[PDB]
Amino acid sequence: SYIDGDQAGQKAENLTPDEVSKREGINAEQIVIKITDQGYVTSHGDHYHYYNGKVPYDAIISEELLMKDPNYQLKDSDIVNEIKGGYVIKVDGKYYVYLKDAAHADNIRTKEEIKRQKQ
Numbered sequence: 510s511y512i513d514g515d516q517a518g519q520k521a522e523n524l525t526p527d528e529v530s531k532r533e534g535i536n537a538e539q540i541v542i543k544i545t546d547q548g549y550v551t552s553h554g555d556h557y558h559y560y561n562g563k564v565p566y567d568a569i570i571s572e573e574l575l576m577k578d579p580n581y582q583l584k585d586s587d588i589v590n591e592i593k594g595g596y597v598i599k600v601d602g603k604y605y606v607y608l609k610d611a612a613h614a615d616n617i618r619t620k621e622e623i624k625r626q627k628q
């Protein structure tokens with residue numbers, strides 16, 4: 510009940526996503542597919558990797574998480590952290606990534622691409 514695949518889950522690195530990857534072996538792009546206050550879960554390399562902390566500046570986000578809203582502009586009240594081109598933000602009790610450039614992909618893999626990036 511509002512925990513499984515939400516706030517909880519297996520894995521939760523304490524160190525940085527870079528320290529995560531190079532530790533285990535894969536050095537692939539970390540595509541954050543799920544964001545929470547208790548950390549995030551990335552689809553990187555081949556698998557899903559879960560950890561707690563902040564998204565690094567050059568991390569990759571899932572297109573499912575990015576914020577394209579016709580009424581919403583990036584508010585510092587919702588900004589939790591900033592990444593390259595986008596902002597990992599918590600608005601309306603939910604987490605998004607505000608992409609300033611949704612056209613050329615400012616760190617965005619589509620759900621389709623994510624599965625290609627995991628190959």
Ligand SMILES: [Zn+2]
Pocket residue numbers: 529530533535553554556557558
């Ligand atoms: Zn991993």
